[PDB]
């Protein structure tokens, strides 16, 4: 408010503020690059789309636009929040109330404008060199801007991939270590050293094709494994080894594959990375997933759709996750129905009102 | 459909398309060669024959031909699908309805013909240098061609042995 008016004129009013430089490069190296960063976002964005909502307005959410369904919208929406900390939703309003179009604008090509009083007046969709300049100097405010929490910045989110940006580059390069080691490596299974009478001496190409053909036919392969291999004077066979055989950055990749899953908040058991057994039997780790990183994330976006879309309506609407018939929370529902169902002292209608039932 | 008509004339209409080269050599080295590849097909092909079916027509399936029983048919049928991704069943119809012969044609010696509109018109059983040219330009279509899923090819299956080669 009053502090915001002072903050604007420091950065510059009326001019675009970009924020993160590398957020276009963390997507290609951290979401199209490694499977752990890929699966972690896909595990969350496909979970928030599956959660039903509680309110008309949801008829817009069920069918926002052509080729982009209800579940496909939140996968695009949360998939921008997990990737770049910012969610955007353009609304096209031919009609005054409940605009019949929603569009997830990607957050690579969007930039904020601080405006006069510190709270934003412009958003700039910049593809190529071409802009749009959406306007926020009105009441319906055609873009909801969902921020992840950022303590240092005043206009953007923190994007958990930015917090895991070291552990992505460890996991990307340790996995590419073993790829290029299997592709650039010369191990021999031995070496036939031929010194000669001198300290140095080549063998003639007559003798050399004799040496290949007795090696090609009689010594290499599975079927020639272990021939006794007569060595006359001058010749000698030094068998080479391969001293680091397995495990090239095997644990530092597996520790970095856990820190990527740590930052987005998925448990190691759901994604499939190896590791020590923290959660027990998937009734917990799936319940932990829909309680520490999905439903807090989904109740934060739905609280912004409940306020941005109510600016198009007259009456304000609440919009919250269901927190009921979501089958990962069944262990919190067994535990609460068997507690009150076994409490026989209080009567029948006195516990339908506790469990959420329509009373009789 | 419409895309298929264009696809045909690229490969060549009226001419046989063979597909996999090595499928005759993966059988000797992967099904007669190692016990793990041998038992894996025998474990599945003897399981699909044991499963009953729900429908007359099953009277054909119970006794397809001489020396080749109901359970022996699906062992031959699935044993070609697991080995070479393709299943074939010739039907001999002296009678118009429910033809009283079924024969698992091996998929080493069978080749497809794309035909005009991309969907097949000919199948060619080639043993030695001798052909047969089964015809698909009719309604009963005397060979069922069971494909395993192949994303890159338009006429054959993927044959899990090729993936484990």
């Amino acid at each position: 408010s009053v502090t915001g008016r002072i903050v604007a004129m420091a950065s510059g009013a009326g001019r675009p503020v970009w924020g993160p430089r590398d957020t276009v490069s963390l997507m290609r190296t951290g979401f199209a690059g490694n499977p752990v960063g890929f699966r972690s976002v896909k595990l969350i964005a496909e979970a928030t789309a599956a959660v039903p909502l509680i309110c008309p307005v949801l008829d817009l959410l069920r069918r926002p636009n052509a080729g982009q369904g209800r579940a496909e919208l939140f996968e695009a929406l949360i998939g921008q929040i997990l990737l770049s900390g910012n969610g955007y939703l353009e609304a096209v309003c031919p009609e005054p109330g409940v605009p019949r179009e929603l569009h997830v604008l990607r957050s690579d090509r969007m930039a904020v404008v601080p405006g006069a009083d510190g709270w934003p007046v412009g958003y700039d969709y910049t593809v190529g060199g071409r802009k749009h300049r959406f306007d926020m100097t009105g009441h319906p405010d055609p873009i909801c801007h969902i921020k992840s929490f950022h303590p240092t910045d005043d206009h953007y989110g923190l994007s958990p991939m930015q917090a895991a940006a070291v552990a992505l580059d460890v996991h990307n390069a340790a996995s590419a270590w073993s790829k290029a080691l299997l592709d650039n490596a010369a191990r021999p299974s031995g070496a036939i050293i031929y010194k000669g009478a001198d300290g140095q001496g080549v063998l003639a190409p007559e003798q050399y094709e004799r040496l290949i053909f007795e090696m090609e036919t009689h010594h290499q392969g599975a079927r020639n494994a272990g021939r006794p291999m007569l060595l006359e004077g001058g010749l000698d066979w030094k068998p080479m080894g391969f001293s680091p055989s397995d495990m090239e950055f095997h644990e530092t990749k597996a520790a970095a594959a856990r820190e990527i899953a740590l930052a987005f908040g998925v448990p190691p058991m759901l994604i499939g990375i190896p590791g020590d057994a923290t959660y027990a039997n998937y009734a917990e780790a799936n319940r932990a997933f829909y309680r520490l990183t999905v439903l807090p994330l989904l109740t934060r976006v739905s609280a912004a759709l409940a306020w941005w879309l109510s600016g198009y309506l007259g009456a304000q609407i609440e919009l919250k996750p269901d927190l009921d018939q979501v089958p990962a929370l069944a262990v919190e529902r067994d535990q609460l129905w068997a507690r009150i169902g076994a409490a026989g002292f209080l009567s029948n209608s006195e516990k339908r009102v506790l469990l959420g039932l329509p009373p009789t | 459909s419409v895309t298929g008509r264009i696809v045909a004339m690229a490969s060549g209409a009226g001419r046989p398309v063979w597909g996999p080269r090595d499928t005759v050599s993966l059988m000797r080295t992967g099904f007669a060669g190692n016990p793990v590849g041998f038992r894996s097909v025998k474990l599945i092909a003897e399981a699909t024959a044991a499963v009953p079916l729900i429908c007359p027509v099953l009277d054909l399936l119970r006794r397809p031909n001489a020396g080749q029983g109901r359970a022996e048919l699906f062992e031959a049928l699935i044993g070609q699908i697991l080995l070479s991704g393709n299943g074939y069943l010739e039907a001999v119809c002296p009678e118009p309805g429910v033809p009283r012969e079924l024969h698992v044609l091996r998929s080493d010696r069978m080749a497809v013909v794309p035909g005009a509109d991309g969907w097949p018109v000919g199948y060619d059983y080639t043993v030695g240098g001798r052909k047969h040219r089964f015809d698909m330009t009719g309604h009963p279509d005397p060979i069922c061609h069971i494909k395993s899923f192949h994303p890159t090819d338009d006429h054959y299956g993927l044959s899990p042995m090729q993936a484990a080669a």
């Binding site: 993160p20 190529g128 060199g129 | -």
Partner: protein, 271 residues
């Protein structure tokens, strides 16, 4: 945050007619003369009084290009994009005022000026001040006021002055015989921004006061000067050519000359 020198921003863009054009050029169509209708006689032939000869003036819609090589404290992509947009906003300002014909918009100063009172269509009109060095010594600002009142009452509905900073300096240096600052009287006033009831545009690409220079312009540039342009800015985020330097490619295309030769009047500091 990386800083830069803060350059002048006022650019004649906000007072001239900005037309979004998509083709290669923009053709404005102005008639050069009048209908020439006369009062008819009661017994006369009365035929073919006259017809205005029209003229197409072509806005060539040139292009502007600047090509810097890029060669984590501050982020270059946003900063260089905030510098090259400023340079494209400032380098077209010089072309709008004193640009020549070759590959760039021809500014309104380069249009073969003719002294007002002998004004024809193909030129711009000026009024002389007096002595060649500066304003007239006996009566200053008489050149300013008859520059205003030698234009035409239809264009003076929304007309503006165009100067640079140190010509508005020499205007505010004008004083009466007691030295009381004809424009913005006290030392506590500031820029009054309403010279002769009309706005002032401080455009630094105007020349300063010299022996013959046209340092003060006045006009309805909405009819006078037509800026035809394409609104976008090309952004080639180039990852090739040089591995060492990104060498971003940014271009905006823009054109413009005068559409109406009657709107703009100049002040020649000569006799």
């Amino acid at each position: 945050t990386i800083r830069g020198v803060l350059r002048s921003t006022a650019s004649l863009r906000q007072i001239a007619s900005v037309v979004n054009v998509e083709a290669t050029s923009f053709d404005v169509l102005v008639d050069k003369t009048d209908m020439g209708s006369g009062w008819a006689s009661e017994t006369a032939a009365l035929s073919e009084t006259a017809t205005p000869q029209i003229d197409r003036i072509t806005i060539p819609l040139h292009e502007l290009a600047a090509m810097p090589k890029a060669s984590s404290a501050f982020d270059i992509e946003t900063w260089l994009a905030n510098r090259i947009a400023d340079k494209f906003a400032r380098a077209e300002a010089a072309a709008f005022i004193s640009g020549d014909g070759v590959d760039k918009p021809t500014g309104f100063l380069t249009k073969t000026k003719v002294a007002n009172g002998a004004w024809a269509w193909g030129s711009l009109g000026y009024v002389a001040t007096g002595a060649a060095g500066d304003f007239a010594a006996v009566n200053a600002s008489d050149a300013v006021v008859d520059l205003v009142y030698a234009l035409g009452a239809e264009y003076r509905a929304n007309a503006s002055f165009v100067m640079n900073s140190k010509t508005a300096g020499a205007v505010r240096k004008m004083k009466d015989a007691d030295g009381r600052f004809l424009w913005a009287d006290s030392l506590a006033a500031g820029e009054p921004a309403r010279l002769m009831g009309y706005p002032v545009l401080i455009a630094e690409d105007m020349p300063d006061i010299a022996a013959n220079a046209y340092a003060i312009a006045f006009g309805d540039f909405g009819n006078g000067y037509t800026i035809a342009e394409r609104p976008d800015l090309r952004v080639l985020r180039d990852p090739f050519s040089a591995k060492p330097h990104v060498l971003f490619y940014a271009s905006k295309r823009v054109g413009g000359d005068v559409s109406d030769f009657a709107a703009i009047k100049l002040l020649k500091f000569a006799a």
